[PDB]
Amino acid sequence: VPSGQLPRQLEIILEDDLVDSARPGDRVKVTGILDIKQDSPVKRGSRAVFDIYMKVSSIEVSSEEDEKKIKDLAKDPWIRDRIISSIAPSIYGHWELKEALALALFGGVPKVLEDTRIRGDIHILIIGDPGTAKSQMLQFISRVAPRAVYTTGKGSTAAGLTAAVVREKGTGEYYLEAGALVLADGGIAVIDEIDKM
Amino acid sequence: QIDYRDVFIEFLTTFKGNNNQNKYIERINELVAYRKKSLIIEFSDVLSFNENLAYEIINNTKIILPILEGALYDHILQLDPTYQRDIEKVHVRIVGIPRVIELRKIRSTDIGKLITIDGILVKVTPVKERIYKATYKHIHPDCMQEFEWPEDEEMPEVLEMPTICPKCGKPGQFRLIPEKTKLIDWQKAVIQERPEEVPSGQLPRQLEIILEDDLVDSARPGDRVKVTGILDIKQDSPVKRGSRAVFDIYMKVSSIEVSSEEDEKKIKDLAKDPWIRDRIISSIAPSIYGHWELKEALALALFGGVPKVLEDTRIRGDIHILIIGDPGTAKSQMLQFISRVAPRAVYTTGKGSTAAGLTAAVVREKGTGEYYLEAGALVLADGGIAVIDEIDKMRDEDRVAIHEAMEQQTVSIAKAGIVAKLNARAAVIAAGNPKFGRYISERPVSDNINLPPTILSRFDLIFILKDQPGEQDRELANYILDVHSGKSTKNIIDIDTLRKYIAYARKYVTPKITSEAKNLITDFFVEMRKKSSETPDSPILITPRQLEALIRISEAYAKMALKAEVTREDAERAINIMRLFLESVGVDM
Amino acid sequence: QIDYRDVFIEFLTTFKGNNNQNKYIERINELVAYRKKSLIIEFSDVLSFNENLAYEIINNTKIILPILEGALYDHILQLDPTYQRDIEKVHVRIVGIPRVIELRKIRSTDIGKLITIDGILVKVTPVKERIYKATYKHIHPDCMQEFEWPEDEEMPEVLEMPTICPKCGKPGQFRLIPEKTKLIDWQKAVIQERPEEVPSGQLPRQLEIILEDDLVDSARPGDRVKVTGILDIKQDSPVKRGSRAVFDIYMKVSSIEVSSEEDEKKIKDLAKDPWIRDRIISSIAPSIYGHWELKEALALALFGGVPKVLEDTRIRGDIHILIIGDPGTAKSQMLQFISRVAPRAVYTTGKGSTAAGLTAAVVREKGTGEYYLEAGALVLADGGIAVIDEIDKMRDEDRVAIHEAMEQQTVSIAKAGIVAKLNARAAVIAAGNPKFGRYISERPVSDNINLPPTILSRFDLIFILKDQPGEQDRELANYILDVHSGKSTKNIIDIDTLRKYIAYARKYVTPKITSEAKNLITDFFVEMRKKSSETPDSPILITPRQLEALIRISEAYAKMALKAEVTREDAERAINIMRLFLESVGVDM
DNA sequence: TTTTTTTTTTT
Numbered sequence A: 001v002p003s004g005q006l007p008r009q010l011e012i013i014l015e016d017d018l019v020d021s022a023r024p025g026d027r028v029k030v031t032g033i034l035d036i037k038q039d040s041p042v043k044r045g046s047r048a049v050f051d052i053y054m055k056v057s058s059i060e061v062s063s064e065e066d067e068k069k070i071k072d073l074a075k076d077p078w079i080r081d082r083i084i085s086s087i088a089p090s091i092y093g094h095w096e097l098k099e100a101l102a103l104a105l106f107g108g109v110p111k112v113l114e115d116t117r118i119r120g121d122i123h124i125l126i127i128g129d130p131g132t133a134k135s136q137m138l139q140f141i142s143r144v145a146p147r148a149v150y151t152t153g154k155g156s157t158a159a160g161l162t163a164a165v166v167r168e169k170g171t172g173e174y175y176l177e178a179g180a181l182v183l184a185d186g187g188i189a190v191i192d193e194i195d196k197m
Numbered sequence B, C: 001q002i003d004y005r006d007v008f009i010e011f012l013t014t015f016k017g018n019n020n021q022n023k024y025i026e027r028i029n030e031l032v033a034y035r036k037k038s039l040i041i042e043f044s045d046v047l048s049f050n051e052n053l054a055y056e057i058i059n060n061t062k063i064i065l066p067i068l069e070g071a072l073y074d075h076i077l078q079l080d081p082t083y084q085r086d087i088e089k090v091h092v093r094i095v096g097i098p099r100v101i102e103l104r105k106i107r108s109t110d111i112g113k114l115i116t117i118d119g120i121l122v123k124v125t126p127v128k129e130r131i132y133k134a135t136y137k138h139i140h141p142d143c144m145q146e147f148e149w150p151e152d153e154e155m156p157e158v159l160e161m162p163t164i165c166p167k168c169g170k171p172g173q174f175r176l177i178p179e180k181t182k183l184i185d186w187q188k189a190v191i192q193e194r195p196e197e198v199p200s201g202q203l204p205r206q207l208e209i210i211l212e213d214d215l216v217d218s219a220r221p222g223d224r225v226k227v228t229g230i231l232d233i234k235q236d237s238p239v240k241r242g243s244r245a246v247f248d249i250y251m252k253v254s255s256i257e258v259s260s261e262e263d264e265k266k267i268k269d270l271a272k273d274p275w276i277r278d279r280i281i282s283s284i285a286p287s288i289y290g291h292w293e294l295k296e297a298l299a300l301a302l303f304g305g306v307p308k309v310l311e312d313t314r315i316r317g318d319i320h321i322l323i324i325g326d327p328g329t330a331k332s333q334m335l336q337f338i339s340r341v342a343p344r345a346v347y348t349t350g351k352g353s354t355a356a357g358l359t360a361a362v363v364r365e366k367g368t369g370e371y372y373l374e375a376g377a378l379v380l381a382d383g384g385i386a387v388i389d390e391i392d393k394m395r396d397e398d399r400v401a402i403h404e405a406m407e408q409q410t411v412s413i414a415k416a417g418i419v420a421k422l423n424a425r426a427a428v429i430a431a432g433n434p435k436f437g438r439y440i441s442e443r444p445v446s447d448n449i450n451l452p453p454t455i456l457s458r459f460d461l462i463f464i465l466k467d468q469p470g471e472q473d474r475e476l477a478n479y480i481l482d483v484h485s486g487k488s489t490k491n492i493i494d495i496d497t498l499r500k501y502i503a504y505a506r507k508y509v510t511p512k513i514t515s516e517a518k519n520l521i522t523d524f525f526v527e528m529r530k531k532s533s534e535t536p537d538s539p540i541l542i543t544p545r546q547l548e549a550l551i552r553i554s555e556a557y558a559k560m561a562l563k564a565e566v567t568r569e570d571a572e573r574a575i576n577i578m579r580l581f582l583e584s585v586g587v588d589m
Numbered sequence D: 001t002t003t004t005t006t007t008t009t010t011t
């Protein structure tokens, strides 16, 4: 996005076996043919201006050499120390906090019992004086995690965190839109300035 | 090709059941007895009897289904002619189709084929009428003729009127004649996929289903059902131009399954054991050890007392239980167990789910602005059990209205020009955290749960759960890890058998109070009042509501053993459990 | 086919009533005398006279009702020639049809047959006009012709215009002529099923009914009614293209019954008892033990005083009662009994207890975006009794909003560009708990009640209920257990005849004050004022409102015995009950 | 319903 501008959007069409090939919030690479979009041909009067939409032919989300590379890293006896040392390299100190943040990236193993369920996710709360690089680390966590969402207490609403009802004015229909917590399912949700929410 | 009508008729009359009893004839006779007009058959039986017939049903259901219905109708009228002039069309429905498709996996290849879907009902529209054979009159000064426009064909889902009068061969204006128009019952429902099968990070899908004829009002909203039928593309408005060559898909329901005499025999047999009362206590929440007093109370709540309806007043028969447990005391384990074991239960929190927190609310219409009513948690749980976790942070509006619903079991509205009264006869089981994090023994109960003392008097029993760091910690730690690995106890009753046991007792047992039980309860209540009077700072008010609790608790014990009357033993147990409750809150009984 | 109008005319004259008085002959006379234009026929008197006439009326209702009505019109014409050119068409109403169908059980087969439905009226639209015979003029320079479009046929519900002029056989445009158009009165109302028949966990359903001609304004919302007629499909917007061959169901009302000379005889017989006052008091909440003085007060509020309307002022005639008591003192149970026996009552416990919900609310009409008033609890209770529960839990700023309603019996709103006044002539009965939940004898009376003196002066009687344990618990426990055992008190006036007695007394008895009663009331008021001046610490102000409370109470006692004037004994009873109220608040006399 | 600024009544 250029300076002082808002992000742009494009409409894509998935057909046949390409449906349900991705989830919202994913970074994708999409290939296909561009075409102009027609929606109300009968609406005569000016409006000789059309929008462009993409006709998808193949979609990629986000492999053998990498797996070999990963296995070699795990062979080092001090791999755990290397991983901790790699969390926010630009921050001095805070070794205990860095160690805990590494654990939350991996997490535990969920367990389904006879009656109840045990979560595998780890929740971390940080309280610190201003200027202690709390926000710098959280920015790093949201960038290194395979799936993460960064939110702020003041810039978030209850509807925007769980699900927002969108009335389809074209047909007068109600349907849900995924919120921040839903989009972070299976990942990490990062909340800054939780005390100010 | 081969006429299966003869095969179908002999199959029904010569079906070897569990003992070759020909159960299909039995239900056919039952159908004639009550004029049910709908016969259901199992696909497994058809396949076992003649797999060739089964394949035709599952492959060409569009063509051969009316053929089979005609053969069945002829057999029914031949067996009994009185069925005529009452039902002109019988219905045959297939269940247990092996072609099961997940809701999210439906594609274009499944359109027009017989498939079955499993899901949850969310919305049900009121019953309406659909035209399948209309009658029209040509308004042209020379015609004055009446005719049925959809000639030799059923009226499609799209209402269309003739352009040229068939009788006079002229165009013009046509008027519908409702008096000579055939109608069929029509209902629309929405089915939603279960949360278990929803992929991660995605919203649940929905599907529109249409119920017609006797299938209307076959399932209350919020029930897990299995639906079988045909898929088709919806046509909301075919005359709407604007491209949009895409369409949704809906389902024409042909058979719906929701979720015995032998059970009643085994239920009565299960009650023959004189130790049945203690067995039921053990069967409650087998995962958690100890907490026998709390387990005993929950068993009484499920059975409940017998409500009294008099000429001028109504007396509550439900039993309300309050649990105040420290954090980490696993107060949500049996609460989840209670919901599963209860035949009808509603799970919610203090704030509720919708705008109507617990009792009810009045909401303006989004489209028209008209005022209507929305049922709360208590109303939706009428006749069952309402499990309300986290009772201590209910809405401020409900903090006053709950007084009437908890005692009079009614919700009264006199707002925005609407006067209404809704029944709320539901037993309430609620859990709340202490207002100071950890419970304080020396302090009273009112200043420990953050509720008005009036509400406390409306609860039959109150129990306090404390996480005492005693010797049990080692056992508790081992117990917690054993639950992680997996373990179970023995000599209990499964939830499935227990659930029907409670349902049977609540429908056929109405215990009566005897003189011996009457005298025992009277003496204890007088004794209760004296003890509270002596203490000038009693932590719990002893009101006449307590006397009603003794009657209700004692009746539950008799209902627990399917007793016709209440005896001394039932009264003695009722007194003892109340004595423990007074000790728990810190009253020297 | 044979005719029956001769038998119908014969039945109207040859039928013998209970005493062979030929009421239908008398009923015809009343119809002619008052130009009633509508006649009511009981179905139980038709099959008894001729069973054959009963079935044809039920079955072929469409093609036999106009025939019978036409014959009756000729019978009236000879009975009174002047009835002509006053009422051109007459109507006959049939009630007590054996075909009664529950609202939820209506299906396709029930359309087109005479049925009966019992329910509750919730809303009525204002009276309108419907065209059943239109007159048109062809706007085409050649034609200039006027005609009635629907020939030999009543104009359908859908407004249809001619396409070809019958006078000239040419197309064009036509102009309606309102001056030559025949109209019929039209009204729409919505009926709701009673809560008794609503299934548990479900919201009540509604049905739309149409009242036409003299049936308009025959009932008001909130009334239990029994309606008879024919169902039909609703063609609200037939011009709406877009498929949707699904139609709703509405009801064409033929007769309506709301909620008898024999009742008057029964009521008058009851008043002959010298101890009728005692019997009425004993009949108030028989299931509640004790509280005799509170039961006496509740009886007075049900009957009330005599409002005075003068050329310059209006004087309140209603009686207001306030009850303060400890929890579990049967306050809510007794209040619920009032709503059952009162002809019109409104209940409000926790929801709608705000200022807007109690008197009136200004709501934005989303149809046009403007503002209009919505009736509150007190306005909806006009002419009846308003019951308020948990008054002590109401906010003080919300509670003061009813000061004008309790005394001036009007509600005035000046908000958001709306200035309006509404009538709120209702009796207010309120219940609540003391300041500290339970009454404390150590604290004075003033802080125990915790209410401003301004609102206390508006209550005619105030009672304090104390739950003090003692020797009466055994009697209370025995009485409660006896109630649970099914035992009931005898020699008690039951519910429905008590409701009739109160309704008759309120609208037919107007006692007047005599000279004997004037002296007794004046003397007590002077004595009461002196006692109040003696003690300045009293929590109750003795204002002139108290003097009028004595007048209102004394009139109610006379009205309770169907007496035409207030005598010495009635004044003495009013003074006696006033003494107890003063003693109940610590004001000795 | 949803975020927004606004005057208003009422949560």
Ligand SMILES: [Mg+2]
Pocket (backbone or CB within 6 Å): A134, A135, A136
């Ligand atoms: Mg920061």
Ligand SMILES: [Mg+2]
Pocket (backbone or CB within 6 Å): C331, C332, C333
């Ligand atoms: Mg009460």
Ligand SMILES: [Zn+2]
Pocket (backbone or CB within 6 Å): B138, B140, B143, B145, B165, B166, B167, B168, B169, B170
């Ligand atoms: Zn024609």
Ligand SMILES: [Zn+2]
Pocket (backbone or CB within 6 Å): C138, C140, C143, C144, C145, C165, C166, C167, C168, C169, C170
């Ligand atoms: Zn003409």
